[PDB]
Amino acid sequence: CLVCSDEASGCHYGVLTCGSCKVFFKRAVEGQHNYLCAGRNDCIIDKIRRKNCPACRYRKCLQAGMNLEAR
Ligand SMILES: [Zn+2]
Ligand SMILES: [Zn+2]
Numbered sequence: 001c002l003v004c005s006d007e008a009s010g011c012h013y014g015v016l017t018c019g020s021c022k023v024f025f026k027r028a029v030e031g032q033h034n035y036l037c038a039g040r041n042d043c044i045i046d047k048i049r050r051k052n053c054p055a056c057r058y059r060k061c062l063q064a065g066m067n068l069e070a071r
Contacts, residue, residue, distance in 0.1 A: 002064035003057070004045050014070025017061050025061050029068045035059055 001008045001018040008016035013025065028035060035058030037043050043056035051057065064071055 002066060003060045004049060005047075006049060012070065013066070013068060015061070015064065015066035017064055017066045021057055021061050021066070025058060025066060025068055026057050 001021065003017055003021065004016065006018040006020075008022075010016050011019075011022070013022035017021075017025070020029045037054040037056040037059050038053045040053065040056075043053045043059075045051060045053065045057045046058060061067075
């Protein structure tokens, strides 16, 4: 993961965030779109690898530069 650092794979979504955040982005993209954090001033879904905010993960998938159809 470009973001979290939970090893990722290239695949169809290109941008190699972990498999989950990709499929996630996908279903997100699709239904639950825009995940605007806990707006808790740039929440970390990283370093320690704890999901302090699921919303924030999508936000940083963007930030990482992860978009659905292989950005
Ligand atoms: Zn990830
Ligand atoms: Zn967050």
